[PDB]
């Protein structure tokens, strides 16, 4: 019952989608943390550094991913095209929920035929709605399911990093400062650095590879 998207398992599972989630489980780890005022995302010798896994889809909304890199790049390109198409047809920038809904729809669409492979990628979408300051963080899955999270981790070590976040996050005492979110993110990563901070009104900073937080957390 494993060898098509069309086939339900006798127990109601569609194994071919669970195998795409197993494909996600092999991708390099991506972490996301919402604060009160920001969302924080993070994750050979002869590599040419100048030519980050966190991809801006629009000035106000950002997409990270884990899983197959090429699939992720195709889905990022489609998300960017949709963001600009909305911004053209309607005057308003896309809602972050609208963007993640579109991405999950695209991932679902590539699940609706046995002749096409589903995207073996899960995305972490972070940003702020235009003229809004509630931080929003979402996950999408190969099935085209999507969910809103206070913090999440996907890929190779998502189990342990998530079990860490489940105890170091507090749903009613969330980190209330940018440095506190970056601290919690780096700590979660140090369980296994690159950090991006997104702030309201289209303000996004890749955090300069400041090792200060690393040294501080190693002192702790």
């Amino acid at each position: 019952y494993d060898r098509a998207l069309s086939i339900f398992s006798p127990d109601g599972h569609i194994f071919q989608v669970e195998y795409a989630l197993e494909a996600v489980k092999r991708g390099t780890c991506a972490v996301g943390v919402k604060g009160k005022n920001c969302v924080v995302l993070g994750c050979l010798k002869l590599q040419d550094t100048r030519i980050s896994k966190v991809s801006k889809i629009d000035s106000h909304v950002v997409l990270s991913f884990s899983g197959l890199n090429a699939d992720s790049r195709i889905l990022i390109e489609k998300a960017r095209v949709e963001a600009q198409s909305h911004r053209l047809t309607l005057e308003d920038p896309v809602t972050v929920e609208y963007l993640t809904r579109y991405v999950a729809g695209v991932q679902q669409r590539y699940t609706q035929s046995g002749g096409v492979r589903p995207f073996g990628v899960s995305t972490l979408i972070a940003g702020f709605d235009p003229r809004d300051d509630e931080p929003k963080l979402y996950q999408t899955e190969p099935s085209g399911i999507y969910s809103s999270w206070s913090a999440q981790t996907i890929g190779r070590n998502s189990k342990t990093v998530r079990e860490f976040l489940e105890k170091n996050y507090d749903r009613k005492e969330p980190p209330a400062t940018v440095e506190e979110c970056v601290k919690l993110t780096v700590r979660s990563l140090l369980e296994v650095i690159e950090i991006t901070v997104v702030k309201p009104d289209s303000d996004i900073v890749a955090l300069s590879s400041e090792e200060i937080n690393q040294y501080v957390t190693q002192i702790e």
């Binding site: 195709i74 095209v81 198409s85 035929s113 096409v116």
Partner: protein, 142 residues
Amino acid sequence: MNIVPQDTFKSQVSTDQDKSVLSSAVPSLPDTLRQQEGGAVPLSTQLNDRHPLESTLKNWETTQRQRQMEQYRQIFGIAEPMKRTMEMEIVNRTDFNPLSTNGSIHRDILLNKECSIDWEDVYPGTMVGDDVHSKIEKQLGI
């Protein structure tokens, strides 16, 4: 049983007539960015004062094919046009190639165009929606 293509004008028009290029935000209007036609400015209303030949030259071959199938139905019965069409659809549906513009080598044999050139052969004639994935989605109907 036509020589010149008769049925050559759209009888009905709608903003949604063009499928696969619709706005995801408002599924009633075109996606002018994905159209890449130079904006909305090619509004569908501008399909006016077409060249008199164009509406016949585009679909000349289709009309010749339809006449040929009609002649085969009249003389040989429903079996022969059915066989021809089934063969042709098998060829069309099994040749998928998103990178090549060229016509299938077997399609030309079935059409009996192995030793024929036309201007469509000589003159076979984008930031969005040109990708291989757009062709995959068109072909599978994703």
